[PDB]
């Protein structure tokens, strides 16, 4: 199980980077870490993706680049995208 405020709480310091790109923080990085080992399961990445996508759609200044680079910038294998137009549904 996971919460849309454990999702969202653990992007928390990636704001800055999502809104402005360039280089994300240590904190943020430790984020995206903290997203990857808490969505071992196929209906928790669901879950997380679910809660990005909502977050995307409500945070209007996420750049959708900076969106889709923050795991390789962070240098995370985080399976799940971050976009308010993803279908979360066809997540592995």
């Given at each position: 199980a996971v919460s849309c405020g454990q999702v969202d709480t653990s992007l928390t310091p990636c704001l800055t980077y999502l809104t402005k790109?360039?280089?994300?923080?240590?904190?943020?990085?430790?984020?995206?870490?903290?997203?990857?080992?808490?969505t071992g399961t196929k209906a928790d990445r669901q879950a997380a993706c679910?809660?990005?996508?909502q977050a995307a759609a409500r945070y209007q200044g996420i750049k959708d680049a900076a969106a889709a680079a923050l795991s390789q910038k962070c240098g995370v294998q985080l399976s799940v995208p971050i976009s308010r137009k993803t279908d979360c549904s066809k997540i592995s």
């Open positions: 790109g360039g280089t994300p923080s240590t904190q943020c990085c430790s984020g995206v870490r903290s997203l990857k080992s808490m679910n809660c990005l996508k």
